[PDB]
Amino acid sequence: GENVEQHPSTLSVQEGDSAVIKCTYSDSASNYFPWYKQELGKGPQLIIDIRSNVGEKKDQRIAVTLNKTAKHFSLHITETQPEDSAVYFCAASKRGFQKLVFGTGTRLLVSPNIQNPDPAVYQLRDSKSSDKSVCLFTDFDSQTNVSQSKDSDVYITDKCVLDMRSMDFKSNSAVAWSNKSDFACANAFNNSIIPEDTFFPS
């Protein structure tokens, strides 16, 4: 019959920023406050907890605060890294994990800082087994948002970031593809706002 209120339900920051998640809880006798981090495709992982009596715990970039009199508790990430992107769940219990009450979750996205933005769109090589033509919008700044296609047989995926670890190089991309005849690269992302200086080769 108890609740834990998690705010905000969505949080998006730039790599380097801090991020804070505020929870409240209704059960006065709660004495254990874990925090779970669930990355896409994985189970939740318990990252920090505050077993009460005290107001603060710090573990490197992760820190939690608890105020039993207000029944607030908080999670603070400093120096966010993109691998902090996940759903975070706060929880409060009085009797261990058996009686955890769970926050509704916060989706943290940390977009990476793009060192040298190089906005361009490329026509990918055709595949002997596909009728599709594939267009790659890559190397754009993170302040750019990719809308979906207003065409029925034009498929546009959302922004995605890959990390070429060995050269410390992160990179945004988005993909459009279609089999329809009236489809080339210069118009795939028209329903989006590419920067003014995006490169279109031939």
Partner 1 sequence: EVTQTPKHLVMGMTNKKSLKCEQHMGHRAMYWYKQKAKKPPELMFVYSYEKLSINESVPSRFSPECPNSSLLNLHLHALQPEDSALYLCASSQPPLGVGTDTQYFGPGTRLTVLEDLKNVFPPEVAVFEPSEAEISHTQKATLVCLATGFYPDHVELSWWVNGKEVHSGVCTDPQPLKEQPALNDSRYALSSRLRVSATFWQNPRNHFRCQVQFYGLSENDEWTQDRAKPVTQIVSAEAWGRADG
The contact set with partner 1 (CB under 8 A) reads: 34, 40-46, 89, 91, 96-98, 100, 102-105, 118, 120, 122-127, 129-130, 132, 134, 136, 138-139, 155, 157-158, 160-167, 171, 173, 175, 177, 199, 201-202
| 109 contact partners, CB below 8 Å, separation of at least 6 | 11, 12, 13, 85
Of 8 and 18, CB closest to partner 1? 8
We find the least distance from the C-beta atom of residue 51 to partner 1, in angstroms, to be: 9
We find the least distance from the C-beta atom of residue 90 to partner 1, in angstroms, to be: 9
We find the least distance from the C-beta atom of residue 69 to partner 1, in angstroms, to be: 25
Of 12 and 138, CB closest to partner 1? 138
Of 78 and 151, CB closest to partner 1? 151
Of 13 and 101, CB closest to partner 1? 101
Of 78 and 101, CB closest to partner 1? 101
We find the least distance from the C-beta atom of residue 12 to partner 1, in angstroms, to be: 14
SS (H, E, C) the chain: CCCEEEECCEEEEECCCCEEEEEEECCCCCCEEEEEEECCCCCCEEEEEECCCCCEEEECCEEEEEECCCCEEEEEECCCCHHHCEEEEEEEECCCHHHCEECCCEEEEEECCCCCCCCEEEECCCCCCCCCEEEEEECCCCCCCCCCCCCCCCEECCCEEEEEHHHCEEEEEEEEEECCCCCCHHHCCCCCCCCCCCECCC
We find the least distance from the C-beta atom of residue 140 to partner 1, in angstroms, to be: 12
